Enzyme design. Structure first.
Site, PDB file in Angstrom:
ATOM      1  N   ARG A 140       0.630  -1.317   0.052  1.00 40.24           N
ATOM      2  CA  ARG A 140      -0.135   0.011   0.064  1.00 40.24           C
ATOM      3  C   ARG A 140       0.811   1.426   0.157  1.00 40.24           C
ATOM      4  NH1 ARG A 140      -4.300  -0.944   4.434  1.00 40.24           N
ATOM      5  NH2 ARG A 140      -4.085  -2.937   3.347  1.00 40.24           N
TER       6      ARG A 140
ATOM      7  N   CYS B 193       9.186   0.216  25.145  1.00 44.20           N
ATOM      8  CA  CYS B 193       9.190   1.584  25.515  1.00 44.20           C
ATOM      9  C   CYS B 193       9.151   2.045  26.825  1.00 44.20           C
ATOM     10  CB  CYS B 193       8.355   2.287  24.467  1.00 44.20           C
ATOM     11  SG  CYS B 193       6.497   2.071  24.649  1.00 44.20           S
TER      12      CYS B 193
ATOM     13  N   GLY C 278       1.926   4.855  21.236  1.00 45.52           N
ATOM     14  CA  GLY C 278       2.658   3.670  21.313  1.00 45.52           C
ATOM     15  C   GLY C 278       2.009   2.520  20.665  1.00 45.52           C
TER      16      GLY C 278
ATOM     17  N   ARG D 209      -3.729   2.896  29.456  1.00 47.86           N
ATOM     18  CA  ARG D 209      -3.651   4.066  28.312  1.00 47.86           C
ATOM     19  C   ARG D 209      -4.420   5.359  28.851  1.00 47.86           C
ATOM     20  NH1 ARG D 209      -0.122   3.330  24.182  1.00 47.86           N
ATOM     21  NH2 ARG D 209      -0.797   1.041  23.894  1.00 47.86           N
TER      22      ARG D 209
ATOM     23  N   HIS E 210       5.383   8.818  27.282  1.00 48.20           N
ATOM     24  CA  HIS E 210       4.707   7.888  28.432  1.00 48.20           C
ATOM     25  C   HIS E 210       5.426   8.457  29.723  1.00 48.20           C
ATOM     26  CE1 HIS E 210       3.343   5.466  25.469  1.00 48.20           C
ATOM     27  NE2 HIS E 210       3.983   4.304  25.513  1.00 48.20           N
TER      28      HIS E 210
HETATM   29  N1  LIG Z   1       4.718   3.010  18.912  1.00 46.37           N
HETATM   30  C1  LIG Z   1       5.634   2.960  19.667  1.00 46.37           C
HETATM   31  O1  LIG Z   1       6.137   3.731  20.408  1.00 46.37           O
HETATM   32  C2  LIG Z   1       6.527   1.704  19.579  1.00 46.37           C
HETATM   33  C3  LIG Z   1       7.589   1.426  20.514  1.00 46.37           C
HETATM   34  C4  LIG Z   1       8.081   0.198  20.750  1.00 46.37           C
HETATM   35  C5  LIG Z   1       7.871  -0.971  19.678  1.00 46.37           C
HETATM   36  N2  LIG Z   1       6.892  -0.602  18.607  1.00 46.37           N
HETATM   37  C6  LIG Z   1       6.223  -1.808  17.793  1.00 46.37           C
HETATM   38  O2  LIG Z   1       6.958  -1.505  16.517  1.00 46.37           O
HETATM   39  C7  LIG Z   1       5.659  -1.789  15.354  1.00 46.37           C
HETATM   40  C8  LIG Z   1       5.272  -0.606  14.715  1.00 46.37           C
HETATM   41  O3  LIG Z   1       5.530   0.646  15.069  1.00 46.37           O
HETATM   42  P1  LIG Z   1       4.641   1.997  14.884  1.00 46.37           P
HETATM   43  O4  LIG Z   1       3.954   2.470  16.196  1.00 46.37           O
HETATM   44  O5  LIG Z   1       5.218   3.035  13.840  1.00 46.37           O
HETATM   45  O6  LIG Z   1       3.313   1.238  13.967  1.00 46.37           O
HETATM   46  P2  LIG Z   1       2.141   1.977  12.746  1.00 46.37           P
HETATM   47  O7  LIG Z   1       2.307   3.392  13.139  1.00 46.37           O
HETATM   48  O8  LIG Z   1       1.019   1.490  13.122  1.00 46.37           O
HETATM   49  O9  LIG Z   1       2.866   1.681  11.454  1.00 46.37           O
HETATM   50  C9  LIG Z   1       3.028   0.292  11.271  1.00 46.37           C
HETATM   51  C10 LIG Z   1       4.171   0.260  10.042  1.00 46.37           C
HETATM   52  O10 LIG Z   1       4.179  -1.368   9.796  1.00 46.37           O
HETATM   53  C11 LIG Z   1       4.243  -1.321   8.235  1.00 46.37           C
HETATM   54  N3  LIG Z   1       3.910  -2.611   7.867  1.00 46.37           N
HETATM   55  C12 LIG Z   1       2.871  -3.030   8.689  1.00 46.37           C
HETATM   56  N4  LIG Z   1       2.321  -4.326   8.026  1.00 46.37           N
HETATM   57  C13 LIG Z   1       3.334  -4.601   7.302  1.00 46.37           C
HETATM   58  C14 LIG Z   1       3.596  -5.638   6.285  1.00 46.37           C
HETATM   59  N5  LIG Z   1       2.739  -6.586   6.208  1.00 46.37           N
HETATM   60  N6  LIG Z   1       4.753  -5.624   5.347  1.00 46.37           N
HETATM   61  C15 LIG Z   1       5.439  -4.410   5.593  1.00 46.37           C
HETATM   62  N7  LIG Z   1       5.130  -3.384   6.425  1.00 46.37           N
HETATM   63  C16 LIG Z   1       4.221  -3.523   7.206  1.00 46.37           C
HETATM   64  C17 LIG Z   1       3.617  -0.253   7.634  1.00 46.37           C
HETATM   65  O11 LIG Z   1       3.414  -0.011   6.410  1.00 46.37           O
HETATM   66  P3  LIG Z   1       2.205   0.820   5.468  1.00 46.37           P
HETATM   67  O12 LIG Z   1       1.962   2.116   5.934  1.00 46.37           O
HETATM   68  O13 LIG Z   1       2.413   0.357   4.037  1.00 46.37           O
HETATM   69  O14 LIG Z   1       0.956  -0.125   6.033  1.00 46.37           O
HETATM   70  C18 LIG Z   1       3.968   0.848   8.536  1.00 46.37           C
HETATM   71  O15 LIG Z   1       5.108   1.558   8.284  1.00 46.37           O
HETATM   72  C19 LIG Z   1       4.704  -2.616  16.203  1.00 46.37           C
HETATM   73  O16 LIG Z   1       5.337  -3.629  16.279  1.00 46.37           O
HETATM   74  C20 LIG Z   1       4.817  -1.759  17.657  1.00 46.37           C
HETATM   75  O17 LIG Z   1       4.273  -2.733  18.550  1.00 46.37           O
HETATM   76  C21 LIG Z   1       6.123   0.641  18.753  1.00 46.37           C
HETATM   77  C1  LIG Z   2       6.231   0.673  23.605  1.00 48.80           C
HETATM   78  O1  LIG Z   2       7.004  -0.270  23.347  1.00 48.80           O
HETATM   79  C2  LIG Z   2       4.965   1.081  22.952  1.00 48.80           C
HETATM   80  C3  LIG Z   2       3.890   0.000  22.981  1.00 48.80           C
HETATM   81  N1  LIG Z   2       4.265  -1.244  23.993  1.00 48.80           N
HETATM   82  C4  LIG Z   2       2.545   0.547  23.765  1.00 48.80           C
HETATM   83  O2  LIG Z   2       2.503   1.606  24.529  1.00 48.80           O
HETATM   84  O3  LIG Z   2       1.532  -0.295  23.854  1.00 48.80           O
END
Ligand SMILES: NC(=O)c1ccc[n+]([C@@H]2O[C@H](COP(=O)([O-])OP(=O)(O)OC[C@H]3O[C@@H](n4cnc5c(N)ncnc54)[C@H](OP(=O)(O)O)[C@@H]3O)[C@@H](O)[C@H]2O)c1
Ligand SMILES: *C(=O)C[C@@H](N)C(=O)O
Ligand SMILES: NC(=O)c1ccc[n+]([C@@H]2O[C@H](COP(=O)([O-])OP(=O)(O)OC[C@H]3O[C@@H](n4cnc5c(N)ncnc54)[C@H](OP(=O)(O)O)[C@@H]3O)[C@@H](O)[C@H]2O)c1
Ligand SMILES: NC(=O)c1ccc[n+]([C@@H]2O[C@H](COP(=O)([O-])OP(=O)(O)OC[C@H]3O[C@@H](n4cnc5c(N)ncnc54)[C@H](OP(=O)(O)O)[C@@H]3O)[C@@H](O)[C@H]2O)c1
Ligand SMILES: NC(=O)c1ccc[n+]([C@@H]2O[C@H](COP(=O)([O-])OP(=O)(O)OC[C@H]3O[C@@H](n4cnc5c(N)ncnc54)[C@H](OP(=O)(O)O)[C@@H]3O)[C@@H](O)[C@H]2O)c1
Ligand SMILES: *C(=O)C[C@@H](N)C(=O)O
Ligand SMILES: *C(=O)C[C@@H](N)C(=O)O
Ligand SMILES: *C(=O)C[C@@H](N)C(=O)O
Lengths: 357, 347, 357, 355
Positions: free
Chosen positions: B38, B127, B158, B244, B251
């Site tokens: 996408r 995180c 998050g 949340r 956080h």
């Molecule tokens: N948010 C935080 O603070 C945080 C912290 C620590 C760990 N994480 C982890 O890191 C991951 C994503 O972080 P986020 O918060 O940035 O998520 P997000 O904003 O929902 O974005 C998800 C990303 O994953 C890519 N993606 C999803 N499905 C895919 C697939 N099937 N093939 C290739 N790319 C794919 C998406 O691409 P498209 O745009 O094309 O769909 C998008 O770039 C999750 O596992 C989350 O739990 C997040």
């Molecule tokens: C931190 O790693 C982000 C995610 N675990 C959350 O806030 O749910």
């Protein structure tokens, strides 16, 4: 130039969208027609070119520079965020994105400036609101606006192709077959989503769209809220009564205003007359005033019956008419598309602000 | 220099990964942005250069030196093995590899040494846990850690970009349309993966991730288990409640610790201030304490409200705040990347 | 019947005091509304009846049987002793009198017997404390309480109407007008009467009330000391961290306890479920737990996320939510009033025990 | 006694309506067979008496007490309002009046009580729905009903007499002439009014009736809506897949339910056994389960394959079978007429427009 998609190409607005684009100043390289599964495969003209209709999907927007949506709130709610993700600039005709602060709500002659900061969706306001803003903005510019009271006389085409057909067959049944108006069977009007439906033949239905919690209908509140947004002024008092009448095309409005400074009537006629998009039709001595049947097919908004209130120093009445499918919908949308092209605003948005499902 | 790949460059963590790389000491000769089908075709800036998003495929990782994964544990489970086979070093910012003994789980300021034994995959920690470790390490070092009790106040960012947008429009519907919060429709929070979703607008949701067998959630269990692994000490008691709140970014944590020996507060304040990655924001006389809106944009972990327990001799309460997309994610990951380069661990 | 005065009828709490009285078992002959000079002379509804608001003065309490006070600590300090001299029984919502040993500090489900020795003033405890007592007393009754550690998630309505409006305006400014949260100007939160003010939109402020000499704030010290007084046990170790979050109404608490004997979790849930005022909302299998948005408008206190500590034999974690305006304030006061009525305790106090300022 | 008229006496349901009335407890002084002009004049038997079929006209219901309509929606649409005007109580076997709040939709074992507020028209529910309601009501009564998932195995008789003869000739073309089933020519199934027709011979067609705007067919949506009406509960989750199979008579259903509280299987079995209109046929040690060919000619609803879900605490699977012409139609309709007579409800009533 552009690849341009029309979503809702087979509808009342879409038919007019096709017509406005054929005469557009927009550089169109490729034109695409999108509807639901029922029209997919079927053919529809652009100038002489023969265009096959496509089903609307999340993946239909690849290569598209501009999409004009006129297929209903659900279609926009579902497929516009994807078009944005794809890199399209969306001009939506529906009410779905109108109150989103991330979305410009634009009548070009009034607030073209709001287009600059767009995030990939620009909303075409409610039709009755559009013609009212055209008529009122030259007045606010000079003397200010304190309040608007509006009663509308809305044509059935604003409720769509089926509504038009429902009205024509109802009238035919009364006039040709001798059926009484209240023995008719309606399926669509006053509102397609609501529980009960009523005959429109020889009727005036004081209901457009469904009711809200304050006993105003949604159409009535759209005028109120869209006015405040387009004009960027929450202090303007607006209340509306929206009625469906037996007219196919062209909405009419009895508009009462109170200005902030007294506004001499002949200066009001001159101000309206000199505003782009607005035509003074006001010569009571030769019975000249805006008329629905004369407004159909024109991109202009017509204004007359302008006269001060009999009691309120700063109060003015008027009669405003426009083709609800053109300035009220397709022409406003094509005008928005042309202004975006003109101001260099036809490009993808890096930051996505509309959630998907 | 290096060919770097950002997997999931379009999401919330991805956007900040770009920002952190633009400013890194990593020598980057080539950069690639990988995401889903996408996003393929669309374009993103790396500084002044336009970079076209590629689809995440099997042979996308040919010629890549480093890949930062931020795209869902599913996507790391599938592609990280092919990346490693292709000879890549993977810094994974998902929960998939976090309890694999062969995968280091690293906060560079705490357990950098763990990187030396890497087998091509290094895991960036949760995180909430990262910021707790930055704040607590300088305290453990000097007076030990017997137990941690933590209540978290977690921002919606998050849980991804779509949680942000869900949160903003929910708020707008209450404030703009007059909708009652309990009458709102939710689709993402508390957790996308679970069966039921609840409004976050004007609410506090005591659920992050899904529930485990023991009535603690996966988020609460991560903070426990990941604290033990990062500090390489299973004897520390850790129990958590994760909530949340309607904060978009950063956080916040109410942290309670008991140390092995009495830690005088003045010295505790001083050990935190001196610890890299931790900033002391603690001056209650001028109302100074860490705030979620102040921490956004910053790579530091802010600590304050530091005070002794009113009864337990060795007990200390604090307030710890950090940007969850930065030190809790993109910055920790880039910091891992930079350490691997500096130690000669990218090959 | 009684003459009943509501002091501070115009405020957030006062408004709910009205709601609770309209639905109360109290025999009410006459209702009176008192506030400051700002509102004196304005009008307000009790049921379908118009009630003129009166200025709170020393001489304003002749004839009144029960006076509910919710007008700030200074208004209680100044006027409650005068109402008591007039023969009123005062239920004070403020912190001013709570620690006077001549004043009962009552949550009717927990320590209603302390009402019998009243001397004209009965204090309604801090809202955070009330809800925690409803949750914990059934536990204490069976397995004892050795210590509490609490972190609160407090709603802005706790800080009054102005704070509610501040929070609404800041949120609108960020979401509608594109203002960054750090560029927002606060005037009330975290603490009306402290030196600096900070934005609450998208923030979590680890300050409620002003700080004390030991670096805990007053809100935190109230929880500590009111717990000891309400439960009549100075040996219960209590420490609190109190935070304000962007929630309009209903406080939530992450509550850790250590009991005296090991308290089994299935039995703990049953004891809490069977306690009056407390409703068990604990079914994680179906994601059931107390939520602030669901507790708004309810007089019940809600308890869930109940689970033993992972290491501490006698440690238990839980989540407690209640409407801070109802059980936290207005409903607790009206319950006190109703129970004072039930036990024949509405009558003048012979000997005056509170200083006239 | 009553003057009874059977409208659509010459169809598949109409023929079983005759059989059920002959053995009925309804007191019958006079019986009348009505159908279209092409049946008029021909004769059918009631017991050992001959009856001349009459054209169904807007006037033919003078003097009738009870009318059983089994002639298609548009026949009930046209003449049932005129019957009502004429003072008749109508039992409508078709789908026209089913979601009309002025019309009770009745399975007497389940909601007989709904008959008392009738306005001259009582609707007989969809056949798949009826059997499913008989089997599930006794479970609901005790442990509640949260959701239903059903996949049907429906006989061709449900699509009328022509459907039976189409199925028969298609099968003979394969079995006798060696015609490829995919080379067969069909004119009625899956649905006569829909555009395209498909062979049923050695096939399973996942379409019954026409499709609706949500991609479920009307048959599927009948089971959804009519379950909610009969049990007077909109909160029950119901989702169906309706399939036509090469069975001449008797519908079969694979039924999954989730109850509100845990419902011991031995007890669930006991409840169904004790419930009127339902027979427990469930002994896997001797391979006893409901079978389509055993069910034909019987007024009972047979239930077996009763077993808890392998995972879902409150989940239960079962196999429900009934003759779709009997309990699914003609018997249900005669049961309504009998209950109306028992309850003193066979009398003249006016809430349906005349066409
Ligand atoms: N948010 C935080 O603070 C945080 C912290 C620590 C760990 N994480 C982890 O890191 C991951 C994503 O972080 P986020 O918060 O940035 O998520 P997000 O904003 O929902 O974005 C998800 C990303 O994953 C890519 N993606 C999803 N499905 C895919 C697939 N099937 N093939 C290739 N790319 C794919 C998406 O691409 P498209 O745009 O094309 O769909 C998008 O770039 C999750 O596992 C989350 O739990 C997040
Ligand atoms: C931190 O790693 C982000 C995610 N675990 C959350 O806030 O749910
Ligand atoms: N009428 C006006 O004057 C006016 C003015 C301003 C705004 N609007 C808004 O425009 C919207 C509809 O315009 P209308 O009144 O002209 O309606 P209409 O005449 O009924 O036309 C409906 C159009 O929507 C298409 N459509 C329906 N479902 C679709 C789907 N799932 N996917 C793609 N296309 C679908 C139809 O395509 P098919 O051929 O497949 O059915 C048809 O092209 C409404 O939301 C209305 O509020 C109307
Ligand atoms: N907020 C809670 O959840 C909660 C809970 C338990 C107890 N309380 C206590 O209730 C008190 C205030 O209630 P609130 O938070 O709802 O405040 P609020 O909304 O700001 O309103 C305060 C009320 O105090 C009145 N008042 C102020 N000065 C006065 C004066 N000099 N004489 C008489 N009346 C005066 C105001 O009257 P005007 O309109 O004339 O100015 C108004 O009615 C505080 O002491 C608070 O601690 C609050
Ligand atoms: N078929 C089933 O298995 C079944 C099951 C449950 C409910 N139903 C309902 O009952 C109806 C048909 O069942 P069926 O088995 O009797 O179908 P069928 O075997 O095809 O026969 C249809 C009957 O309707 C009569 N009819 C048709 N057009 C008529 C008209 N214009 N005026 C008067 N009578 C007319 C026919 O009379 P002629 O002989 O003159 O054509 C025939 O008796 C359907 O609406 C269906 O929903 C059917
Ligand atoms: C204009 O937007 C058309 C629609 N509001 C109507 O008239 O129904
Ligand atoms: C409860 O008494 C409300 C108030 N203490 C607050 O929330 O600040
Ligand atoms: C029973 O109602 C028969 C019909 N629904 C069918 O099988 O199609």
């Amino acid at each position: 130039g552009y690849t341009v998609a029309v979503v809702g190409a087979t509808g009342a607005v879409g038919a007019q969208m096709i017509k406005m684009l054929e005469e557009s100043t927009l550089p169109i390289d490729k034109i695409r027609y999108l509807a639901s599964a029922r029209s997919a495969g079927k053919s529809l003209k652009f100038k002489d070119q023969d265009i096959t209709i496509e089903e609307t999907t999340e993946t239909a927007f690849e290569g598209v520079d501009i999409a004009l949506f006129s297929a209903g709130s659900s279609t926009s709610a579902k497929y516009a965020p994807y078009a944005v993700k794809a890199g399209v600039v969306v001009v939506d005709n529906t009410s779905y994105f109108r109150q989103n602060p991330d979305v410009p709500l634009v009548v070009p002659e009034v607030n073209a400036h709001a287009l600059d900061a767009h995030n990939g969706i620009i909303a075409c306001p409610n039709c009755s609101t559009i013609q009212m803003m055209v008529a009122l903005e030259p007045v606010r510019q000079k003397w200010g606006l304190d309040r608007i009271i509006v009663s509308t006389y809305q044509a059935v085409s604003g409720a769509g192709m089926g509504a038009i057909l429902e009205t024509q067959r109802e009238l035919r049944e009364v006039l040709n077959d001798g059926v009484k108006p209240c023995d008719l069977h309606a399926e669509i009007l006053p509102s397609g989503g609501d529980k009960k439906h009523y005959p429109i033949a020889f009727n005036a239905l004081p209901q457009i769209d469904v009711f809200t919690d304050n006993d105003y209908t949604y159409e009535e509140m759209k005028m109120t809220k869209e006015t405040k947004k387009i004009m960027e002024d929450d202090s303007i008092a607006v209340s509306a009564t929206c009625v469906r009448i037996p007219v196919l095309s062209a909405h009419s409005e009895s508009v009462y205003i109170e200005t902030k400074e007294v506004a001499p009537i002949e200066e009001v006629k001159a101000a309206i007359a000199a505003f782009p998009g607005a035509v003074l039709e006001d010569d009571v001595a030769h019975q000249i005033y805006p008329q629905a049947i004369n407004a159909v097919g024109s991109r202009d908004t017509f204004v007359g019956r302008i006269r001060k209130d009999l009691d309120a120093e700063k109060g003015i009445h008027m009669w405003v008419v426009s083709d609800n499918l053109l300035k009220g919908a397709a022409w406003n949308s094509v005008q928005i598309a042309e202004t975006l092209h003109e101001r260099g605003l036809v490009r993808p948005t890096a930051e996505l602000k509309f959630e998907l499902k």
